[PDB]
Amino acid sequence: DYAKKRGWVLGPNNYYSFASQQQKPEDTTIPSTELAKQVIEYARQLEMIV
Amino acid sequence: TRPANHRQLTFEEIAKSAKITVNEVELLVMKALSVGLVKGSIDEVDKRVHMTWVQPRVLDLQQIKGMKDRLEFWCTDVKSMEMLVEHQAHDILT
Amino acid sequence: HGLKGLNSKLLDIRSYLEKVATGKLPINHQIIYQLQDVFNLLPDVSLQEFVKAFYLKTNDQMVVV
């Protein structure tokens, strides 16, 4: 029952198969356009007459 | 040939393409750096020659169409992001 | 104004290049390789150390703001 449950199957003297890890890809400069929105809003609060 | 995404070229492809030996590659690219057509640098620990600049060459019609396509790809984003600054700021820029 | 001027200049360059590209006018042997060095520029925005420095300076500006 535990040999057929999920990944990491076991039975022949060692438990092998179905490894699980991560790669972590990133760019991190994607919200730059979003940053533009933020900084323009700042000037927005600085420039409409109270 | 490579489109400046991975401009770095390994020594193995240099010695396979130019059919020169293993230890004779570096002086060869030094000779290129002697003249001025090539403006790269060489890293010996990983043994890779990084590339910065290549002297221009003659181009034909299909290359001109590809250049025009890339220039249009650059031409669209200027308008597309001028709409960003003009649309989100009306009464500041007046 | 700078964005509009850049758009106008790139539109003129595209107009000339597609004019000489499609049969009309002779292929000038210069300019086409003089404008080749333009495209050798425009460095990779999705580069690790460039982004790592860019956020390092953006935070330094945001402290003052």
Side-chain angles (χ1 to χ4, degrees), chain A residues 1-9 11-14 17-50, chain B, chain C residues 1-24 26-34 36-43 45-65:
Chain A
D1 170 48
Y2 302 136
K4 316 306 155 217
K5 176 198 212 125
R6 293 182 183 174
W8 286 106
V9 283
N13 196 30
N14 194 1
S17 291
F18 212 117
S20 91
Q21 267 321 111
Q22 50 243 49
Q23 293 177 335
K24 203 191 172 293
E26 60 98 354
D27 175 41
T28 299
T29 196
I30 43 151
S32 64
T33 281
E34 162 62 39
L35 290 188
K37 298 187 186 296
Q38 294 192 357
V39 68
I40 294 162
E41 179 292 310
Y42 296 157
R44 197 136 59 245
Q45 294 300 320
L46 205 46
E47 273 317 317
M48 331 290 138
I49 285 97
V50 281
Chain B
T1 315
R2 293 182 183 174
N5 295 326
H6 218 72
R7 194 104 92 168
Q8 325 104 315
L9 275 66
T10 44
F11 59 88
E12 276 280 78
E13 75 194 276
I14 274 290
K16 183 57 215 72
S17 296
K19 54 190 302 176
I20 212 69
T21 88
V22 163
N23 296 315
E24 287 291 325
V25 287
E26 301 92 1
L27 306 97
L28 206 160
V29 71
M30 201 97 88
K31 183 61 176 179
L33 263 298
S34 80
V35 180
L37 275 66
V38 175
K39 284 209 278 271
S41 69
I42 303 106
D43 298 9
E44 285 252 7
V45 63
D46 42 317
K47 196 41 214 76
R48 281 139 61 158
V49 179
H50 184 80
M51 271 324 307
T52 76
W53 187 81
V54 63
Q55 75 103 37
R57 72 178 74 257
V58 293
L59 266 71
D60 214 327
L61 269 190
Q62 281 77 20
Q63 315 237 51
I64 289 321
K65 304 316 147 280
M67 294 300 293
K68 182 203 54 58
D69 289 345
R70 200 133 65 218
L71 163 67
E72 215 267 356
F73 218 59
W74 185 31
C75 183
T76 318
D77 59 43
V78 170
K79 193 56 159 156
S80 295
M81 214 268 278
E82 174 49 50
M83 289 315 89
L84 201 75
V85 55
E86 183 178 2
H87 170 266
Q88 243 175 279
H90 283 9
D91 304 1
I92 297 181
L93 75 83
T94 59
Chain C
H1 264 226
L3 260 296
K4 298 322 283 167
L6 193 300
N7 221 14
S8 182
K9 291 315 220 61
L10 274 191
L11 264 180
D12 297 2
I13 282 299
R14 207 271 305 283
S15 75
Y16 154 75
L17 205 38
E18 183 178 2
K19 168 246 196 164
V20 298
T22 51
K24 169 62 192 89
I27 295 184
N28 181 213
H29 182 62
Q30 186 173 355
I31 284 286
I32 51 160
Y33 63 89
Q34 213 281 332
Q36 198 269 342
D37 289 345
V38 156
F39 280 59
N40 186 340
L41 271 307
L42 314 171
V45 188
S46 157
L47 183 63
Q48 200 54 47
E49 60 268 29
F50 176 57
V51 161
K52 183 178 179 180
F54 195 56
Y55 285 129
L56 177 63
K57 274 288 206 164
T58 316
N59 285 321
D60 283 333
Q61 277 199 237
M62 282 302 146
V63 152
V64 154
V65 179

